[PDB]
């Protein structure tokens, strides 16, 4: 979820150990998502109330 | 173009009340500034530089159009020497492919001799040179060729002695009415290159002057790569 956007809803976060990366390739770089930052399901509430 | 309608000037805007000053820039742009340079002054300065240069463009065009070039054909020396440098350049290019190109005269120089008494100007170059057939074809029938032929503007008659690598030295002489080409009596005196003896007109006596020819060389041929020699 982008921090800048307040409307983002972190419905379901990943585990503390979970991370997102290419399984085959070694983790040279910092993970795109690490720990609880990783989101499995997220929701949005628009200003017009669209969901 | 998009719309029409140009406003007029409000000669008496000042009386208007409760309105903001629409001239701050103008007034402030001329206020005497002690220990500082006035804004207006710097502006004027650059304006002079840019504007002055622009005027020079008009100057140049004025001359080109308003002139008579051939009437004031002091450029004839430029044309003559420019050919001499060109021919030296051509032979230099030929020399790289063929050693024999420079065999007649390895040294590439221009020698100028002024004969005021005889109304003759001799310009000698060690360039590519010209054959007998080329003398009749290129010189016997004209045509740009202006570089050599500018001489006639100040000269009644032109005498050319040309020796090319492929042919023996031959002399082409024309008075602008008829031309004759004969084998050079002296033989390959040049080895290779062309020496032009110019039968100047009465009006061209000033060109015969040693100072005048040198001034023309500086004026037009100063940038020639090959050294230029003036008789002294």
């Amino acid at each position: 979820a982008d921090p800048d956007n307040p409307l983002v809803l972190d419905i379901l976060t990943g585990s503390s150990t979970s991370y997102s990366f290419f399984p085959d390739k070694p983790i040279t770089q910092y993970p795109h998502a690490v720990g609880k930052n990783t989101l499995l399901i997220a929701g949005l509430q628009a200003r017009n109330n669209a969901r | 173009v998009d719309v029409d309608g140009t406003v007029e000037e409000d000669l008496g805007k000042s009386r208007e009340g409760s309105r903001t000053d629409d001239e701050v820039v103008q007034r402030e742009e001329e206020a005497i500034q002690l220990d500082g340079l006035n804004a207006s002054q710097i502006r004027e300065l650059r304006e002079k530089s840019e504007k002055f240069a622009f005027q020079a463009e008009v100057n140049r065009m004025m001359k080109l159009i308003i002139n008579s070039l051939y009437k004031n054909k002091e450029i004839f020396l430029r044309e003559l020497i420019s050919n001499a440098s060109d021919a030296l350049d051509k032979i230099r290019l030929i020399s790289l492919t063929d050693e024999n190109a420079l065999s007649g005269n390895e040294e590439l120089t221009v020698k100028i001799k002024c004969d005021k008494e005889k109304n003759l100007l001799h310009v000698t170059d060690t360039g590519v040179g010209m054959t007998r057939e080329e003398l009749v074809k290129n010189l016997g029938t004209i045509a740009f060729g202006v570089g050599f032929y500018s001489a006639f503007l100040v000269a009644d008659k032109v005498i050319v002695t040309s020796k090319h690598n492929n042919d023996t030295q031959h002399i082409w002489e024309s008075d602008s009415n008829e031309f004759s080409v004969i084998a050079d009596p002296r033989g390959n005196t040049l080895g290779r290159g062309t020496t032009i003896t110019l039968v100047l007109k009465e009006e061209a006596s000033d060109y015969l002057e040693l100072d005048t020819i040198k001034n023309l060389v500086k004026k037009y041929s100063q940038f020639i790569n090959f050294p230029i020699y003036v008789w002294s």
């Binding site: 921090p3 770089q29 | 065009m61 004025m62 308003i66 008579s68 070039l69 004209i142 045509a143 060729g145």
Partner: protein
């Protein structure tokens, strides 16, 4: 024609080299506002000089299709009429709109040039060499002579063109630019461990 006149053909073409060299020089200039100002001086100086040159030839009464202009007074006028008109054709072709605004309006200028164009067309000067087409092209451009079906002034383009209502290429430019903006945002988030909402 006259042998000296044949020499003049070389003389006229020689001037053309300087005239074209300057013509390129004027192109180097960018501002149109300066460009018209000098160009207007080109027309006023050239046409006024042309008016004297035609008067000089008129007093001479030398046929255009005739012996080389010999007397210096007429001969320089012959240089001015042919050489200046040839440059005038280059100026007209390179700068069609500018000349037409400053030239078509004046009847005297059109008539004076028309006398010159016929005067050149009878001399035969624009019959040989690479500048012979210039006489035909300029007359067509000015409407003195019928325009050829394939005759198009390369310079006479409509720089105004048409409003770029169709800008799908620019829409792609917008996308890519905003896309780079979007890529940097993600890269920023990467860094290392941030705090958790």
């Amino acid at each position: 024609l006259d042998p000296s006149l044949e020499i003049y053909k070389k003389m006229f073409e020689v001037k053309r080299r300087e005239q074209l060299l300057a013509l390129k020089n004027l192109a180097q200039l960018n501002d149109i506002h300066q460009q018209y100002k000098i160009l207007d001086v080109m027309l006023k100086g050239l046409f006024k000089v042309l008016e004297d040159s035609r008067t000089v030839l008129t007093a001479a009464d030398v046929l255009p299709d005739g012996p080389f202009p010999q007397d210096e007074k007429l001969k320089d006028a012959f240089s001015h009429v042919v050489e200046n008109t040839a440059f005038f054709g280059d100026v007209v072709l390179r700068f069609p709109r500018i000349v037409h605004y400053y030239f078509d309006h004046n009847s005297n200028w059109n008539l004076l040039i028309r006398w010159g164009i016929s005067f050149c067309n009878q001399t035969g000067v624009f019959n040989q060499g690479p500048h012979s087409p210039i006489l035909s092209l300029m007359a067509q451009e000015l409407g003195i002579s019928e325009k050829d079906s394939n005759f198009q002034n390369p310079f006479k383009i409509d720089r105004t063109e048409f409003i770029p209502s169709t800008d799908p290429f620019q829409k792609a430019l917008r996308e890519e630019e905003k896309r780079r903006k979007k890529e940097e945002k993600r890269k920023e988030i990467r860094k290392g461990p941030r705090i958790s909402r």
